[PDB]
């Protein structure tokens with residue numbers, strides 16, 4: 001509260017670390033569905049159904065331009081990629097399988113990096 005400062009974790013390396021995680025995501029063999037925005041003129045329904053599209057190139061641009069206030073806002077956008085994927089794609093599809101794999105991959109990096 002006012003003039004009572006709580007201990008806070010050291011956030012000084014967060015940008016570099018989130019960048020490293022994103023790099024690992026981008027170079028994963030199952031990243032292919034997620035590298036660019038879903039093409040809204042080519043995928044019927046996407047624009048209507050998925051209210052907040054997100055993809056790795058958009059996350060990279062945001063990270064490079066200071067558009068994430070903190071590491072949690074970055075994780076929210078990464079998870080949004082996978083949540084969109086599950087909404088639109090059958091779990092039993094190549095893209096649906098890729099999304100599950102990439103989410104698992106991400107979350108373990110996230111825990112290993114930032115949870116002590």
Ligand SMILES: CC(=O)c1cc(-c2ccccc2CO)c2cc(Oc3ccccc3)ccn12
Nearest residue numbers: 032033034037038039042043084085088089095
């Ligand atoms: C993430 C997602 O839902 C997704 C991604 C694609 C995709 C993957 C590689 C290249 C291009 C695209 C589309 O921009 C994709 C495609 C989808 O539907 C199609 C499947 C086959 C041919 C054309 C469209 C649906 C979802 N995604």
